Amino acid sequence: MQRGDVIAILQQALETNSFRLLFQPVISLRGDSHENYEVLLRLLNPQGQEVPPAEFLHAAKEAGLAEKIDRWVILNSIKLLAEHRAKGHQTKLFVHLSSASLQDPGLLPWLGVALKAARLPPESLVFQISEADATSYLKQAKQLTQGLATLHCQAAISQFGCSLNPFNALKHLTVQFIKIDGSFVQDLNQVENQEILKGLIAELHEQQKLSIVPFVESASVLATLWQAGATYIQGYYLQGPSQAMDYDF
Amino acid sequence: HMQRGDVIAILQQALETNSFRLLFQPVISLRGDSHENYEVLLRLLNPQGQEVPPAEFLHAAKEAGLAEKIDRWVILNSIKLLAEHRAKGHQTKLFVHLSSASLQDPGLLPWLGVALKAARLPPESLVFQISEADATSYLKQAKQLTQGLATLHCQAAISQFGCSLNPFNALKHLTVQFIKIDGSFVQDLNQVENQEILKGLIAELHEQQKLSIVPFVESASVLATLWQAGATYIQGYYLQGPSQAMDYDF
Ligand SMILES: [Mg+2]
Ligand SMILES: [Mg+2]
Ligand SMILES: [Mg+2]
Ligand code: NA
Ligand code: NA
């Protein structure tokens, strides 16, 4: 019961609408009152056991289902936002887009329709694409990001800073948030890493981006990142992924 | 609380109370190999019994200078489990991850010899798995570590292989028997092009005398493609996901 054909389990989670959505809050250090949450996707097998994320994420690609799962995630997110601005909550969701989605001319038209249906507050959704993907497909990244702006969505680049000249890719994109890569967060006891981190963050602030620094695993890491100038932070010390959007912002 | 905490503090205490959990994911032979082979994976529960996401505690470890201590905990507990799983007809081999902090520590190798001296394991019971990026950043220490492992009758693997500028260059200077191909090569295998690249890569690994391991077998169609390509070993949830027990039927 810790095995299965993940490609078939995915084909059917889709058909029973049975993925599980999790939410990991993004914490504002500089006065953002939104309830920002990153959306994460989980999958259970028929026997109710969780399939390792790396495995079903790789399955989804092996099956050519990435884009179709993105649409399920987007529609269910749109749903939840509609149901959450129901109360006072200023919820904002960070939703991942696969490379397959990025390369797809059809995403934008499709999205415009769904958003119209839902009638959500503007700037309710942020689409997050990896640095590697934006860099592979700069032209499509450029097209997609301008498009989102017309729809009153925002964009984020994640795993930022690992490429040789990472700020170049940002030249023609419309992106408000930049989530720095996890590697920058390691061993900040070494003054040199504090400086690398600090200059990355300052360079981002200089290009007028909002920095998001992940993997805050204790209060000292949090304090260090606050001093370094981080706009937002995320990590288990604040809250790990949860099935509910119940974080006290 | 239920789903938050200071993971650095949790790690420091987990180390002291031995309350990490080891899981095992079978590495499965297509070329007969006698062994039960398992990859060792580390899990962590918070004090309230809820699982801390591995990426979060692996980062916490690096943030607190605890990576090598965690590796040593895993090694000792892996040695322990092997000696016990020997209590049966199980010719088990374990793949154990080494962090870049361990790879860099010249203290590692003599410490390893003491750990092994005490446990009386069959030779070639442990394979130490280093990522390509780590091996490539620290090639001198990887050369030294891997020659040393052979002296200790251990083996070595490079994982996420095939992503660096010239992947086969690093291999010239290391003592490594297993090569675990990066998952990037296992995508879109639907496409004949990607099948041929993978097939070629595996063939080249064979030429260079390495045993290839291909991860992310997520269905029969993927297994089917990999079979054809002559992979020495495979791994994935379609065969068996990580489990708390070494009870796969090889
Ligand atoms: Mg299938
Ligand atoms: Mg996250
Ligand atoms: Mg594994
Ligand atoms: Na945008
Ligand atoms: Na700082």
Numbering used by the authors:
A (entry chain A): 438 to 686
B (entry chain B): 437 to 686
What do the authors report?
FimX (PA4959) from P. aeruginosa is a 76,000 Da protein identified in mutants lacking twitching motility in response to environmental factors.
Residual density in the active site of both EAL domains of the asymmetric unit of the P43212 crystal form leads us to place a molecule in the active site. First attempts were carried out with c-di-GMP substrate but yielded very poor fit. Instead, the accommodation of 5′-pGpG, the reaction product, in the cavity was much better and acceptable. In the complex form, two 5′-pGpG molecules are inside the cavity. Interestingly, in the complexes, the 5′-pGpG conformation is very different from that of the c-di-GMP preventing clashes between the two ligands inside the dimeric catalytic pocket.
